[PDB]
Structures are given as C-alpha cells and as structure tokens.
Design a protein around this nucleic acid. Structure first.
Ligand SMILES: [Zn+2]
Lengths: 150, 242, 60, 36, 104, 121, 58, 174, 68
RNA sequence: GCCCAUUCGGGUCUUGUAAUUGGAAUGAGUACAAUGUAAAUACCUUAACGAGGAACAAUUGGAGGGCAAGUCUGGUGCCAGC
C-alpha cells in the first residue's frame, strides 16, 4: 500500500530557502498584471526597483488563458503580458484555474517566487512554507518573506 | 555489519524484479541473471532451492548506482518491470546496467548505449556474459545511426552528462520510445549548470520535458546517497496530453 | 533573586553556535542530508527500508 | 566472518559473540527486577 | 495623552484597595486609590505582584504609568488603566527583585 | 591516435599545475598513482592529472577506465618532473588528484580549470 | 533450550521497550494537545476582536 | 556614520532562520555583523541599479561601472571573468562576507574550525604579511590572500613559547 | 512564570509514614487515593451493569452455540 | 533514547549525560621601563606576574510547568477555581 508523503525539498532549510539565488524567477499572474496597470507601475523595472536584482518573469499557459478569457477590458494587460522580455511556461493539467495551477507549480519546485495579488492565493502561498510572494502596493511592489529584501 | 556468512531473508518488494534482503540491517537486492560472477565487485546472496539447485542474488550499492538511490528513497512506480524493454542512455559500465538487466529478466532486453571507448570495451566484455543486453558504442546525441539495430523500446532511462539532456532524451524517445511509455531521467545539477542552483535547474529541465511532450509525474531528489541529482519519471503521452 | 541563567547564555558567539549545531542535527529529521557518502565498505543501508512508502513529490 | 563462526542461523550467530550476550543478560535482569 | 500630555504622573496613594480579598494575587487585591496631583483627582492603579504590594502604604508619592493589556486574561477586571512603576523615588520592580531599598 | 590523447598544451599546463601547487599548500591533493585511484574509486576527486612520459605509460593509463566511468575529468601533462616540482615533493610524482572540498579557497580556480579541460576534451 | 531462552529474552526486552516508547509518545501528545488548546483559544479571541473591529465602522 | 540598518522587519521566521544559518556557518557574534555586511551590499547594488537603468556608452556608466567592478574585484567578491555590471546586481551576501578574515583563514587552513579561527585571530596570531590583525571583520583584499601566516611574535609562529607553556615547563622541571 | 521567584516556587517534600505504625506502613497520600477511588468506582459500575442485566435476564434466549 | 510534522506517521547513536580528563593560546588586569605630552593620563609598545567553577562570576526580558499531613472560595461525595 503506497503512501506518499513528499519530502521537504532538500534545497530548503527550516524556512530559509537558500535555493533563491538573486537572479530570480517570478510567477506573474492575472490580477497582479491588472493591478500593476491600474497602479501604473512598470513590470521589469518595477520588480528591479523592489528587489534590487535581475528578475526573469514567467507566465504560464493557464494564466495566459485567463488573461485572454477576461475579455476586451484588459487588452492593455494582454498586450503588456505578451512581452518578449518575459518567458513562458507550458502547463499540462485539466482546468485553466490560475490559483491551483500556481500553487501546485510552486509547491513542487520551491524555487519560484509568486507575484500575486488576490486574497485566497496569498493565503495558500503564505500557508505553505518558504516561498516568497510579492504584490502591488501604493506605487511600488512589496515582498512578504524574502530573507534578503535589501 | 552485513559480513560474509550471515543469513538474510529475501522478501519481495513493490517493484517486481527487485527484492529486499532483510537481515539485522537491510539491503536492496536483485536476482542475478548469470550466476557465479560479480561484475563490479558487489556482494552476492546465494540461496539454495530444491536435484539440488543454487541461485544467487546481487546487492545494489546505491552510492555507486543511480536509480538504486531512487528505489530506496521510494518512487511510486518505475517502468522497469520484469518483462519490458529498457533503453539506457549513458550506460557507463556494467555497474548499473547489470542491475537493470537482471531486474528486466531473461525475456526483456536492455539496449545500453555509450559514447566513450574504454567504458565501451568494458561494457562489451561484460555484455558477453549475460545475453539480454545489447551494447551500443554510439553517441546518444545521434539516434539515427543506431536506428538500424534497436526497435520500439518500452522505457528509457538517462544518465548522460551533457547540458543538452532534454534534447538527447527527446530525440531518443521520439525515435524509439513507444506511446504511453516511461522515461526515467537522472539530472545532475552541478553537471548541467554550475551558475544557478539545484531547484532552478531542475524546474528548467522538467519544463523542457513538458515542452517536448513527456508529461512528468515524479520528481525525487535522492539526497542521502548522492548530492543534488534528481530522478524525474515521466510518461510519453503524444495523444491527450491534458 | 534572579533565575539561574546559563553559561551558554553568557557569550553570544557560543549561544549562536550551540543553537546552530542543534539545528544542524535537527534537520536530520525532516530531510536526509548529504553526510559524505559511502564512508566504509557498503554495510547495507543500516536503518530500515520499507516497501509501502514513496517520498517523491508528484506532478498533480 | 570466520569459518568457525558462520552458524546455521542468525540466532546462533547472535549467540556466538560476547557483547550482545552481556547487554542481554544485564538488560533482561534489570527488566525482571523492574517487573518484581 | 491619557492625562494631559505626560506619560507618567506622580500621585498620592489614598489606601490599599481590597486588603480583605481572600484570594491571594487577585485583581481586586492588586488595586490602590491614587490621588493624581497634576489635576487633583482620584484614580485606581494596578500594582503588580501582591507580594510586592506591601511596599506602598500611605502617601508614598507614587509614580503611575499606563497598563496596556496584550490580550485577555482569566479574572482580570477592566477599568484599571494605570499601573505602578515607581514608588517614592525608586522603581518597585527593582524593589521586588530587592536590588535597591525603599527610602522614607 | 596515441594512447595519451588529451595532452594539454603549454598555457593550460601552467595553469593546471599552479592550481596543483596551491592545492598542495592547501592540503587538498593526493600524490601518486595508487592513492589517485584509491581516491578515485572512493569518489572524492575534482579532477585527475597524469604524466605522459613515464617509462611504462600503462601504469597510469589504468586511470582513464576509472575516471571517465565515474565521470570526472582527466588530463595528461608532458612532464613528470615538472609535475613533481608542481606538487612540491622530491621524487617525480606521475599521477596527481585534487580532492573535492567546499571548504577550500581555490574553488574558483579549480572550477575554471575543470571547465577549461572539459572543453578541451 | 538455548534458543528458547534467547527468544524469550528478546521478546521480553522488545515489548517493554516499545511499551515505554508508546507511553512517552502519549505523554508528549498531551502537551501538544495543551499547546494547540492555548493556540486555538488565542486565535479565537483574536478573530472575535477582528470581527467586531470590522463592524465598528458602522 | 550609522553603518548598520534595521531591516524591513526584524521579527520574522525566515529572517530568523537566515541569521541562524549564517551565524552558525560563518561563526558570527550577533545580528549586527550580518546587518552591516547586508547593508553595504544593499548600498553598492542600489548604486549599481542606477548605472544599469541609465543607457550604455554614457561616460558615467562606463567609468563608474569600471570603478565599481575594480573595487569589487579588489575586495575579491567578483570572479575574474564576470567583469560586467549586472553580475554586481547578481551579487549575494554569502560570497561577500566569505572574504572576512575569520572565514578566510579557516579556508586557508591553520585553524581547524571557524570558531578557533576567530578566537586565535583575536588572540593576535595572524598577520597579513607584516601587519598583525587582531580583528575578524577585515574583508581581506584579493592580492593579500596568500600573505596569511602566523605572526613571528606569537608562539604559533616562531617566537618564545607562551606563558602557560613556560610556566608549566618551570613547575614541571622543578 | 510571569512575576514569581524561584524561591516562591521551591519544592515541597512530602512527609513519611510514622515509625510508630511502621508495621502497616506506606502512608497513602492524595494521588494514591484518587488512583484507588476511580478504580473502585469503575469496578462498582461494571458490577452494577452486569447486575442490571441479571435482573433483566430474559429467560428465553437461544443461540446455536448453546449445545455443549 | 533523541528529534520533527493539525494524530495515528517520518527519520536517526553519525544522541545525550558525565570535573572520569589533558595540555596549549590569551588579554581584562597588574607592572618594571620606554613611548606619547607644555607636564601628565589614555592608546600604541613591553620585560616579570596575570585561568579553570577559566569564582578573573552577562545581563535584560518572555513562555511554561511540577510539588504539601498547607491555606482560601464555590458544589450535583473522591471535584472545579484562585
Ligand atoms: Zn496551467
């Protein structure tokens, strides 16, 4: 009888997560792009101004499907998120739901940082241990649990 | 502990083909195909069966074999069953291919490829002993020049030490692996990228797999035996990926 | 009229050492960290292998 | 292992040495004394 | 702010409120009636540790400070906003851990 | 196609054997053929060096079959007496090895050397 | 008789070792239970403060 | 002056385990040492961010980035190949505080542990060439990394033996 | 510990059994009393539940197991 | 016997208690002397002294317990609370 308890991924400390070297990989998602636009900050230069390090953004196919699905009010968001500076993942699961796609994607790798803004996703991300989220705030970004913010 | 002469029970494991050797301290043990001769110097259990016959078993030293550490750390399912055909990208010498061979058994085959030459002659001198393996001394980056001699393997396995790991396994699996077939790769982080660290390079490699249509399903790290490798198990979907 | 304080608590460099090497030995109980490898000859895995347990994180 | 020590089973192999017998006698006697 | 602008106010104790409370170290035992001097009024202060309640007796020119509960307790009374921090020159924490000596 | 194929030219020779002398002064080096193969089949070996003019060549040519099986780089050097002067020892050592150690202050030069010789091979 | 006395000794060591290991685990399970009781009590009073601070904007 | 700065929050789990791991790994005294090194790292890469966000071929970016990388390779935290400006952006606190004299003499040998390294170089034994250094937080430059040895006026070098050794020699020769 | 001293929470040792009555010794304190009394209460409760079933015995019960 | 995770689970002598114990290195000090200085102190030097509880005695908080032939309040015995 096969039980399955996932081991704590061995590039993690107690909660320090030494696998997050300063060239970062972030996970952009949908209402974070929308709030970045309606707070009028940029994306790559905004992340650089918040983290003082070179950040590579990533968007998944599930989040791109959500951004296409949300209609023509966010054509600015879609034109911004088809940026050649960002990269793109490729998901393989059923149901384009950004929340469980994101939190599954990060809890089986523990190396991405999650750039989110909605309440349930922030709650699940800060529930699971040792991955940093960032969010919009005022006219800049804000990091929640990176060990070296400065 | 585990000296030469103790009596050890041989219990079967979940992965059919391998066995647990439970003494006062446990071992992982595969049933030897050619009895009487160790291949890389490992210790051998030797049981008797009733016309009296005597069959022997080899231990599986996980500090010197790759997938033994994944087996002992506990993988959900491999694809190396006792009947399948198994391709072995980056067969170094006998030291792991003999274990995969006698897991596979007398019916299935193991096609072991290798690029270097001196491990090639060691592999051939081992390969004359048991018959279920095929030694190939060709580069794993060119699966169109040993396409003559193999066909339609049922699970591939990968230990090559090159930073185009995903391209190697993608080309060999498109050329040879059947649909709904297994692919077990073993990435070495410090080998394929020295700059950025282990979880980032693992996520980049598994993203390259799910771009090359292998749907991955297991990632294990095998930390107490080797450092910063990982075993990534996947299926080859090709039809209904999601 | 003070509690009994600690010789470990006196020098901060020592207390930030005896906290680390405990927490160094703590995470031999949440992961399985690399400790040099095959030191002697292979005496078996020496502490128990169980069948019905898979410590592999799976892809949802 | 030496040929005069390879016993027929691991029970007699465990009886064949000395430190295990020492620990077993002192631990078993302490257990009987704790039960009484 | 809770008394004009100052953070601390010297005060004169009227009487130890609740000496007849039978349960030792209780809320109704650990109160004193302080006459605030800065505006000449009454207030009920909350000296910690009834074993060190009996340093202050009568017009001991006590010095108050706010209390600020960091949660909710079992049988603590509300209404007391003031704790004793210094009595007749010395600090009664130092008096209770018996470093200094109360002068008279 | 000789038996000592990855023979290093001059500038790469000089940088790998000043890394050798830094390792010998940092207590991180194993000197000699049989201690080299002992540390090689123990596993602690960043890379190994042989000398391509020992009077029997096979007494260190037995090291390729171990090292390229256990996936560790190996380099021939055209002078055993220069490698002896590099290791800092009287007699000419013909097969040196650098142990693996992440508490040694020549990790950067060791990795630069290892990348150069993996590109060489 | 040697084997039977040995097996009786091994069993009467092992069952008592596992017995006191079990009772030690139960003893510390009691303190884990009390720690969770204090934690849930503090969290419940904090949330019943927050749910009326959410309504004192009326 | 005010070198060290309090972080954006000092009571947090990930920060606490960060200071625990760094302190017990490099043998540190208190949080002020990590905060000083972290501050000056943050200051120099905050200065590097502006030189990045302005354009190339500006003389400011050209020779001020050359000045910054010359200073950082002189301290030694930047390798000889990555001599361009965004690796300064990709710098980290670990290989920046690794060049302090405590960790550096432990890596050089001669101490058998990081804590023994700290207590001997504050017991005045290690001299970089000619100058006896009795302080850990040195950030030894790359050129003087090979001049570390026991000082000649100290009984781990070649001086007179210490007071414990000669007092025990006296009252064990009596 | 909030605001107490260690001398305020020192140890109270327990007094022995008198030597004048040492024949039936081992004076029996409160913890041993409660470990006696809860055991006696449990024995009385199981005695009264089997007494209650005896007073309601229902004299016409039958199973296949009552042949021998 | 240890440690970790809402619980049953996981992992480990490579884990704790012992002056059993050994010698080495020191500056706080103390001090000839020189140094500095208008003169003198301090630092920088430095002979001779200067460590085991290194008692040559680091504090300030905070979270929990547990103990009586003891005390007090309540009640639906042997309990609940302070
Ligand atoms: Zn998706």
């Amino acid at each position: 009888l096969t039980r399955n308890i996932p081991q704590v991924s061995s590039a993690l400390f107690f909660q320090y997560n030494q696998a997050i070297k300063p060239p970062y990989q972030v996970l952009i998602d949908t209402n974070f792009i929308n709030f970045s636009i309606q707070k009028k900050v940029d994306i790559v230069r905004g992340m650089m101004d918040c983290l003082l390090a070179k950040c590579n953004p990533l968007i998944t196919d599930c989040v791109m499907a959500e951004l296409e699905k949300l209609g023509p009010k966010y054509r600015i968001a879609l034109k911004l998120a088809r940026d050649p500076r960002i990269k793109r993942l490729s998901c393989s699961h059923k149901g384009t739901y950004a929340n469980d796609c994101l939190v599954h994607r990060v809890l089986q790798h523990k190396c991405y940082i999650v750039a989110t803004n909605d309440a349930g996703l922030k709650q699940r991300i800060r529930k699971i241990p040792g991955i940093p989220l960032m969010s919009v705030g005022g006219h800049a970004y804000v990091i929640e649990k990176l060990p070296d913010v400065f | 502990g585990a000296r030469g002469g103790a009596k050890v029970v041989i219990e079967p494991h979940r992965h059919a083909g391998v066995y647990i050797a439970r003494g006062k301290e446990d071992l992982l043990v595969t049933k030897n195909m050619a009895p009487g001769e160790s291949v890389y110097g490992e210790k051998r259990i030797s049981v008797e069966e009733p016309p009296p016959t005597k069959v022997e078993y080899r231990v599986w030293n996980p500090f010197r074999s790759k997938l033994a550490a994944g087996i002992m750390g506990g993988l959900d399912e491999l694809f190396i069953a006792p009947g399948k055909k198994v391709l072995y990208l980056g067969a170094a010498s006998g030291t792991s291919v003999s274990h995969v061979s006698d897991v596979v058994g007398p019916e299935g085959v193991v096609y072991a490829v290798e690029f270097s030459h001196r491990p090639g002659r060691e592999l051939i001198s081992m390969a004359k002993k048991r018959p279920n393996i095929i030694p190939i001394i060709e580069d794993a980056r060119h699966p169109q020049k040993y396409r003559m001699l193999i066909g339609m393997v049922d699970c591939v396995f990968a230990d090559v030490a090159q930073p185009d790991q995903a391209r190697i396994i993608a080309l060999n699996s498109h050329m040879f692996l059947k649909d709904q077939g297994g692919v077990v790769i073993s990435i070495k982080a410090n080998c394929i990228d020295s700059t950025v660290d282990a979880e980032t390079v693992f996520a980049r490699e598994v993203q390259k797999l799910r771009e090359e249509r292998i749907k991955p399903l297991e990632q294990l790290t095998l930390e107490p035996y080797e450092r910063d490798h990982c075993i990534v198990v996947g299926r080859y979907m090709r039809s209904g990926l999601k | 009229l003070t509690p009994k304080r600690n010789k470990d608590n006196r020098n901060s460099r020592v207390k930030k050492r005896k906290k680390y090497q405990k927490a160094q030995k703590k995470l031999k109980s949440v992961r399985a960290v690399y400790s040099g490898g095959q030191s002697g000859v292979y005496e078996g895995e020496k502490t128990g292998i169980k069948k019905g347990l898979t410590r592999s994180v799976k892809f949802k | 292992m030496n040929r005069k020590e390879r016993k027929s089973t691991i029970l007699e192999t465990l009886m064949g040495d000395e430190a295990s017998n020492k620990y077993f006698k002192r631990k078993y006697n302490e257990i009987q004394e704790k039960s009484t | 702010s809770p008394f004009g602008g100052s953070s601390h106010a010297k005060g004169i104790v009227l009487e130890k409120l609740g000496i007849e409370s039978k349960q030792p170290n209780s809320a109704i035992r650990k109160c004193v009636r302080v006459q605030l001097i800065k505006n000449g009024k009454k207030v009920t202060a909350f000296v910690p540790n009834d074993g060190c309640l009996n340093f202050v007796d009568e017009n001991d020119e006590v010095l108050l400070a706010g209390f600020g509960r960091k949660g909710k307790a079992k049988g603590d009374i509300p209404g007391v906003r003031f704790k004793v921090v210094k009595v007749s020159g010395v600090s009664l924490l130092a008096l209770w851990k018996e470093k200094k000596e109360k002068p008279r | 196609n000789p038996k000592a194929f990855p023979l290093a030219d001059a500038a790469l020779t000089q940088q790998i054997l000043d890394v050798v002398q830094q390792a010998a002064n940092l207590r991180q080096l194993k000197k000699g053929a049989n201690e080299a193969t002992k540390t090689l089949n123990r596993g602690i070996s960043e890379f190994i060096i042989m000398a391509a003019d020992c009077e029997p060549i096979e007494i260190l040519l037995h090291l390729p079959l171990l090292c390229e099986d256990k996936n560790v780089p190996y380099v021939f050097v055209p002078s055993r007496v220069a490698l002896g002067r590099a290791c800092g020892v009287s007699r000419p050592v013909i097969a040196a090895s650098i142990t693996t150690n992440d508490a040694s202050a020549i990790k950067t030069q060791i990795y630069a050397v290892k990348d150069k010789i993996e590109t060489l091979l | 008789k040697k084997a039977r006395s040995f097996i009786q000794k091994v069993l009467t060591i092992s069952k008592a070792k596992d017995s006191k290991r079990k009772e030690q685990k139960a003893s510390q399970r009691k303190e884990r239970l009390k720690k969770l009781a204090k934690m849930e009590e503090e969290k419940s009073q904090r949330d019943k403060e927050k749910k009326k601070e959410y309504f004192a904007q009326n | 002056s005010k070198t060290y700065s309090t972080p954006k929050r000092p009571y947090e789990s990930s920060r606490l385990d960060a200071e625990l791991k760094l302190a017990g790994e490099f043998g540190l005294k208190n949080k002020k040492e990590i905060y000083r090194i972290s501050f000056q790292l943050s200051k120099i890469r905050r200065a590097a961010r502006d030189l990045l966000t302005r354009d190339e071929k500006d003389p400011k970016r050209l020779f001020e980035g050359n000045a910054l990388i010359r200073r950082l390779v002189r301290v030694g935290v930047l390798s000889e190949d990555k001599k361009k400006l965004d690796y300064v952006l990709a710098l980290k606190v670990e290989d920046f505080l690794e060049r302090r004299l405590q960790t550096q003499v432990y890596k050089l040998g001669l101490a058998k542990s990081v804590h023994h390294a700290r207590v001997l170089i504050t017991q005045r034994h290690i001299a970089v060439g000619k100058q006896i250094v009795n302080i850990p937080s040195f950030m030894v430059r790359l050129d003087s990394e090979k001049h570390i040895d026991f000082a000649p006026t100290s009984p781990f070098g070649g001086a007179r033996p210490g007071r414990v050794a000669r007092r025990n020699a006296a009252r064990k020769a009596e | 510990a909030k605001l107490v001293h260690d001398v305020q929470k020192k140890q109270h040792r327990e007094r022995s059994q008198l030597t004048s009555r040492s024949r039936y010794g081992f004076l029996e304190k409160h913890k041993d009393y409660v470990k006696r009394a809860q055991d006696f209460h449990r024995k009385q409760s199981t005695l009264k539940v089997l007494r209650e079933k005896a007073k309601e015995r229902n004299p016409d019960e039958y199973y296949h197991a009552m042949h021998s």
